[PDB]
């Protein structure tokens, strides 16, 4: 299958490519730009790069956990499965270092992914080649093989002891795979922000919890490593606690306890540090742990301030309204009225209807307005015998309004300028002759002033917290400007 390998390196059409490049035609143009690049160029949004980086993350986490425990706590680090594990890992990392010479580079300074095979080489050499080249090759086995090639009988004096100490130091160059771990996790978390829309504070605090666990683990390995390379002098914390000859589990547990004690701000180990190794290592672990815990408090605060943002914005708005009422020295009755109005208008959380209906497109706006109000405008017989385009063009002019119980919605004797549709609540129509009718949901009132443009003949008082839709006369005239046939029909039926 010489075509399937060429297909997997190219960025396939998925949710991510359609969201990045915009159209399917742009993704096909990107596939053609990968095709015209050269000999087997890997695009960093493909499927092969994804599954390869997934296997590399599942290998790097295991390497960064297993390798310091294998180096520091065990004495003979030349057993057969340990060498097998290191050689298999370094084989995968050399394969990844070769494949980095064929992967495109996503630059955040443009929308142009670099696919020039010479320019990716001249960028990867100038950016991240030295770290990956150190962390890929087994420098310790190179030093061991070269030292035994120089002297096959090197174990005569205590110089071979220094060779073993320097082997254990050079084998910590495999901890520079953290750079590739960080660069792969950021590169795929940006993609998963683009696709799935997860909260940014959750992602950053998961990243920080991962780094805190990894640094606590490395510091716990380090505070046993440095007394181990000094052959456990009588002032290190290992020999003071008489735990030189315990099992490696107890050594790792108590060392990780020292690291976590100086990380989460508790302290100490058994006693205070004594030797000059332990004092400076404890100060290093204290600096690293206090920095990581301060950043954890920062990410937790940024997470908590995004949980109730709408209700927080509501309370900021209502404190501004409290200041407005205090500035003009309003009586407390009106303050109770305004408080009840904001409790029954926004229901404790802030939203701006005008900006939200402005940001939406046209069919979503029409769909929301239809679902809200077409069941109400169908109940009026002036509108059921008209153009559906007239109704659709008229529904945009409705305004949502809220009235408290006791309010005069329509005061009798004024110029009628608005027509009201009832969504929720019960109103009372007072007319002359001491007649008081009740209107409820799905009803309407104030329609004579729309047609005739006269004055008010009856009062309307709200009895509950009424949610109403309003239609002005001027907006109705603007709707009649485009539809003159229904205007002439209203002129004839008005006769």
Ligand X SMILES: CCCCCCCCCCCCCCCCCC(=O)OC[C@H](COP(=O)([O-])OCC[N+](C)(C)C)OC(=O)CCCCCCCCCCCCCCCCC
Binding partner of residue 260 among a copy of itself, ligand X, none, CB cut-off 5 to 8 Å per kind: a copy of itself
**Separation between Cα atoms, residue 70 and residue 166, nearest integer Å:** 15
Site string for a copy of itself, 468-487 (x = CB under 8 A): --------------x-----
Asked if 46 contacts 6 with a C-beta cutoff of 8 angstroms, the reply is no
Considering the complex, state which of residue 19 and residue 250 has its C-beta at the smaller distance from ligand X.
250
The SS3 of residue 100 is: coil
Residue 353 annotated as part of some ligand binding site: yes
Residue 490 annotated as part of some ligand binding site: no
For residue 471, which phi and psi values (nearest 5 degrees)?
Answer: -140, 115
Residue closest to ligand X (Cβ): 249
**Separation between Cα atoms, residue 282 and residue 268, nearest integer Å:** 9
Binding partner of residue 116 among ligand X, a copy of itself, none, CB cut-off 5 to 8 Å per kind: none
Examine residue 386 and tell whether it contacts a copy of itself (CB under 8 A): no
Handedness of CA 127, 130, 131, 136 (dihedral sign): positive
Considering only 37-45, 133-141, 353-361, 471-479, which stretch makes contact with a copy of itself by CB under 8 A?
353-361
Q: Which of 249, 332, 381, 388 binds ligand X (CB under 6 A)?
A: 249
Examine residue 247 and tell whether it contacts ligand X (CB under 6 A): yes
Residue 442 annotated as part of some ligand binding site: no
Q: Which of 8, 191, 350, 380 binds a copy of itself (CB under 8 A)?
A: 350
DSSP string, 23-42: SHHHHHHHHHHHHTTSSSPB
Binding residues for a copy of itself, rule CB under 8 A, total 129
Q: How many helices (H) and strands (E) does the chain have?
A: 22, 8
- The secondary structure element, H or E, covering residue 421 is strand 418-424
Q: 228: closest CA among 290, 277, 271?
A: 277
Binding partner of residue 431 among a copy of itself, ligand X, none, CB cut-off 5 to 8 Å per kind: none
Residue 91 annotated as part of some ligand binding site: no
Considering the complex, state which of residue 20 and residue 260 has its C-beta at the smaller distance from ligand X.
260
Q: 68: closest CA among 192, 171, 188, 152?
A: 171
Considering only 175-183, 243-251, 288-296, 447-455, which stretch makes contact with ligand X by CB under 6 A?
243-251
Asked if 460 contacts 429 with a C-beta cutoff of 8 angstroms, the reply is yes
Binding partner of residue 248 among a copy of itself, ligand X, none, CB cut-off 5 to 8 Å per kind: ligand X
Examine residue 306 and tell whether it contacts a copy of itself (CB under 8 A): yes
Examine residue 287 and tell whether it contacts ligand X (CB under 6 A): no
Considering only 3-11, 69-77, 134-142, 311-319, which stretch makes contact with a copy of itself by CB under 8 A?
311-319
Query: Which residues on neighbouring strands pair with residue 426, listed in sequence order?
Result: none
By CB neighbour count within 10 A (0-12 exposed, 13-18 middle, 19+ buried), where does 169 fall? middle
Verify cis geometry, omega within 30 degrees of 0, for the bond prior to 268: yes
Site string for a copy of itself, 240-279 (x = CB under 8 A): ---------xx--xx-xx--xxx-xxxxxxxxxx--x--x
Q: 398: closest CA among 464, 485, 480, 468?
A: 468
Residue 292 annotated as part of some ligand binding site: no
Binding partner of residue 147 among a copy of itself, ligand X, none, CB cut-off 5 to 8 Å per kind: none
Q: Where are the beta strands (DSSP E) in 349-412?
A: 399-403, 408-410
Considering the complex, state which of residue 279 and residue 384 has its C-beta at the smaller distance from ligand X.
279
Examine residue 276 and tell whether it contacts ligand X (CB under 6 A): yes
Examine residue 426 and tell whether it contacts a copy of itself (CB under 8 A): yes
Considering the complex, state which of residue 24 and residue 431 has its C-beta at the smaller distance from a copy of itself.
24
Give CA separation, 155 vs 121, 141, 163, 245, in Å: 43, 17, 9, 25
**Separation between Cα atoms, residue 313 and residue 351, nearest integer Å:** 9
Q: 344: closest CA among 401, 296, 387?
A: 401
Examine residue 396 and tell whether it contacts a copy of itself (CB under 8 A): no
Binding residues for ligand X, rule CB under 6 A, total 8
Q: Which of 403, 421, 444, 445 binds a copy of itself (CB under 8 A)?
A: 403
Known binding-site residues for 3',5'-cyclic AMP equal 446-447, 449, 456-457, 460
Residues of the shown chain interacting with ligand X in the complex, contacts defined by CB under 6 A: 247-250, 252-253, 276, 280
């Amino acid at each position: 299958m010489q075509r399937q390998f060429g297909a997997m390196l190219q960025p396939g059409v998925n949710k991510f490519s359609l969201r990045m490049f915009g159209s399917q035609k742009a993704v096909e143009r990107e596939q053609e730009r990968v095709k015209s690049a050269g000999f087997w160029i890997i695009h960093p949004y493909s499927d092969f790069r994804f599954y390869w980086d997934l296997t590399m993350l599942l290998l790097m986490v295991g390497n960064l956990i297993i390798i310091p425990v294998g180096i520091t706590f065990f004495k003979d680090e030349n057993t057969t499965p340990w060498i097998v594990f290191n050689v298999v890992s370094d084989t995968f990392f050399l394969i990844d270092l070769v494949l980095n010479f064929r992967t495109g580079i996503v630059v955040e300074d443009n929308t142009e992914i670099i696919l020039d095979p010479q320019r990716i080489k001249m960028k990867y050499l100038k950016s991240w080649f030295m770290v990956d080249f150190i962390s890929s090759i087994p420098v310790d086995y190179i030093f061991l093989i070269v030292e035994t090639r120089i002297d096959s009988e090197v174990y005569k004096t205590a110089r071979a002891l220094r060779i073993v100490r320097f082997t254990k130091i050079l084998s910590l160059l495999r901890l520079l795979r953290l750079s590739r771990l960080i660069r792969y996790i950021h590169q795929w978390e940006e993609i998963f922000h683009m696709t799935y829309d997860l909260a940014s504070a959750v992602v950053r605090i998961v990243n920080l919890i991962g780094m805190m666990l990894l640094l606590c683990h490395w510091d716990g390995c380090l505070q046993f490593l440095v007394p181990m390379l000094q052959d456990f002098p009588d002032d290190c914390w290992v020999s003071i606690n008489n735990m030189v000859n315990n099992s490696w589990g107890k050594q790792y547990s108590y060392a990780l306890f020292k690291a976590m004690s100086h990380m989460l701000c508790i302290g100490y180990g058994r006693q205070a540090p004594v030797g000059m190794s332990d004092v400076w290592l404890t100060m290093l672990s204290m600096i690293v742990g206090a920095t990581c815990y301060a950043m954890f408090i920062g990410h937790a605060t940024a997470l908590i301030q995004s949980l109730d943002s709408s209700r927080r914005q509501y309370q900021e708005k209502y404190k501004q309204v409290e200041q407005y009422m205090s500035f003009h020295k309003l009586p407390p009755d009106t303050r109770q009225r305004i408080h009840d109005y904001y409790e029954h208008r926004y229901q404790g959380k802030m939203f701006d209807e005008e900006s939200i209906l402005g940001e939406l497109s046209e069919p979503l706006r029409e769909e929301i307005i239809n679902f809200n109000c077409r069941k109400l405008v169908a109940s009026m017989p002036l509108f059921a015998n008209a153009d559906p385009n007239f109704v659709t063009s008229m529904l945009t002019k409705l305004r949502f309004e809220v009235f408290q119980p006791g309010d005069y919605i329509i005061r009798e004797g004024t110029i009628g300028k608005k027509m009201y549709f009832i969504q929720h609540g019960v109103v009372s129509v007072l007319t002359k002759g001491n007649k008081e009718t009740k209107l409820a949901d799905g009803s309407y009132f104030g329609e004579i002033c729309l047609l005739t443009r006269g004055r008010r003949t009856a009062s309307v008082r709200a009895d509950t917290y009424c949610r109403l839709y309003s239609l002005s006369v001027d907006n109705f005239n603007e709707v009649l400007e485009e539809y003159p046939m229904m205007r002439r029909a209203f002129e004839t039926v008005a006769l």
